[PDB]
């Protein structure tokens, strides 16, 4: 010691205190959606946000002292740091995206409850086996997006004028969402063979993903 | 008479008789849909229904004396109870919801044929493992629906004006329903970076889905 | 009558001739589709048509002599039988539709090639173990069509005006097809609570589907 | 050095070198999609391209003499060959589709990298397994397309006027893309029974599809 409190924080009671708080501020932020609540009780709720934001700043500080540099190879906490930090840049300041960003803290419920922690851990763990198929596909999107841009962006700029648009569109087509009547039929009014681009494209991205799911499943 | 009654409820004719009426009522309920048919034979049917509802009412009565508490620890029968119960209440009474809700008694055909009861049970048995993946997704939806209401509810109130609306819109998107031409493209015209909310959202939401099944298959 | 003919049927000439003809009649049926070809060669192919069915009908008779009672408890032979008898339907205008049912004769390619029959039969083989589920749906879809026609057919006759219409509409939403912006958002404009029919309906119809496949998986 | 040239090629510096040129070109070709960029670097990169093909041209020539008959029985190099050949047409010729086909050379990143090769080589190997199914499906699409064209093309020529269109359309219905409100329901205004073609059509293409994957799964 070193630790004078170290045993707290480690303590079961204290964390669930954070967990009990998180679900509260999470409840607050929900109610903060109602314009009616914010005219009638906005005041109870702004300070409340700050108590919780203070306590959290506190709790994070405490946790770093105990763990010294070893807290910063814990992703969950790294997450807890940046997510609480996020909630600390001011509300009516510069960039209201940051105003919304502070709701990300509600994912701390995952961070503080090992079971969600366990789930998130399970899902990310299938990612490393996939990066190869993720690598091929991204290359393909990159190549076809380019072809689509050069083949169709002059007469159809909304969908294909810029590389990014071809990416966004191809993704849509990839998601198969309103792809015939929505994208290809029109295209085909001007360029009758455009199905020769799109129909194969649809085949490949669909074939691969399917087999991708099989490889996960086959133990 | 305890044994005398018990010997009645268990006969293969009682089961077949109630089942046959179920097959019959279900047919009438189908018949009840034609307003031509109603005009001509409507009266035949409004009464057959209550005749059937009574015979069914008796069956429930008979089965409870025999089983006492063992009738009410059986999930299938409780449902049977609650389904005939709801079929008890009158059309004029309250509002015309129960009047439709009554069609749920056709779920007795599942209730009464042992082959189907097995299928349902097999099916339901898949559910309990999911409560972990179920819960996580629910938190994710809650958080994101909140970010969505604050970001998009002023200019797109119908889709996102409300927590609920943001929930609805999101599931629709989750189902990938006309999500692209229908929602994100419009959003992007006011808020050009809206693809930065939905594309990731779609990823999380589709990946977790895969894994819900993989874990089902693998487990 | 057995001995004379039998020597023709099991031979490689008989089987190869019929099959290669299938491919010929299939090539020939593509062209009938272009009115340009039909105004310039229609008379050639309407009778080329006439000869294959002639060749197929005769072929059916022989195979029946040679196989006797064993012909009509063989499904593939039975199919060709049915698929040919149909192709025997009048050329002239008894009435128009059955005329289109003739292209089914291209399914003789399935019957007559052993690799495809393996596939088809393998496929059909999956059906019996699924049927208990199936029935479940048809009870489920039915209960709901009844509910749907009573709830929505008044203000929305096109989609829910008839039991049969509601079934259709209901099949559509299961396939998840333009289901929200297309169907249920409008419903909600009059009946704000329609999501209580369709969001559950969707979980259920989807739950069953996934689980149908896993049942395929274990088997 | 008709023979001995092999030791220069095949070197670890060699293979990796061609990869670095692919990545630059892959980057510079993305830049070719931009109209702004082409203004102040077009000639710099118009210059860049042909050098790469040339080098590639040089690299393909060297590798052939080293491998002789074997080079042209290497699947990855044949691609290399032809995707280089495409790039070898002149810049300002008659068919501007070829110019666009140039970016196909970014796929050499697949043939030149065994891990890329590993996924692609693995994926294709699945194909021979489905060829019995693919022939089946293509036979099935062909049959229903014929039927569609004779059935709906006169009143709906845009969608069914011709075989190809019916193919496209049928392919569309099969991705279930806007099929109902988009394709079938309109049909039904004129041909009330069209769901009888399409709902069965849907079951079948979905049935074969799902089961195809399960076979992939078990194997
Ligand atoms: C925060 C709880 O979720 C909701 O706010 C909603 C309810 C609350 O009931 C929840 C019923 N639940 C079991 C599906 N109905 C469901 C169903 C919705 C939803 O988005 O479904 C996922 C929304 C809603 C949708 C459409 C119009 C208004 C509103 Br309010
Ligand atoms: C036929 C697609 O239906 C699905 O439910 C699947 C989704 C989509 O379901 C969730 C809702 N969705 C439309 C986003 N992801 C894709 C990619 C799948 C596929 O392999 O077919 C292309 C299947 C699937 C998911 C999980 C486990 C096994 C399978 Br088979
Ligand atoms: Ca759509
Ligand atoms: Ca859709």
Automatic annotation (TrEMBL), chains A, B, C, D:
Q: One GO cellular component from the entry?
A: voltage-gated sodium channel complex
Q: MF terms per GO, please? A: identical protein binding; metal ion binding; voltage-gated sodium channel activity
Organism lineage reads as: Bacteria, Pseudomonadati, Campylobacterota, Epsilonproteobacteria, Campylobacterales
Q: Which domain of life is it from?
A: Bacteria
Could you list the residue ranges that cross the membrane? 12-31, 43-66, 78-98, 119-147, 193-218
Give UniProt keywords alphabetically: Calcium, Coiled coil, Membrane, Metal-binding, Transmembrane, Transmembrane helix
**Which residues are listed for sn-glycerol 3-phosphate 1 binding in this entry?**
30, 34
Q: This protein is called what? A: Ion transport protein
- Covered range within the whole protein? 1 to 219 of 267
Residues annotated to bind Ca(2+) 1: 175
Binding positions for sn-glycerol 3-phosphate 3 per the UniProt entry: 162-164
Name the source organism.
Aliarcobacter butzleri (strain RM4018)
Q: How does it sit in the membrane?
A: Multi-pass membrane protein
The Ion transport domain covers which part of the protein? Answer: 12-219
The primary location reported for this protein is membrane
Tell me where in or outside the cell this protein is found.
Membrane
- Residues engaged in binding Ca(2+) 2: 178
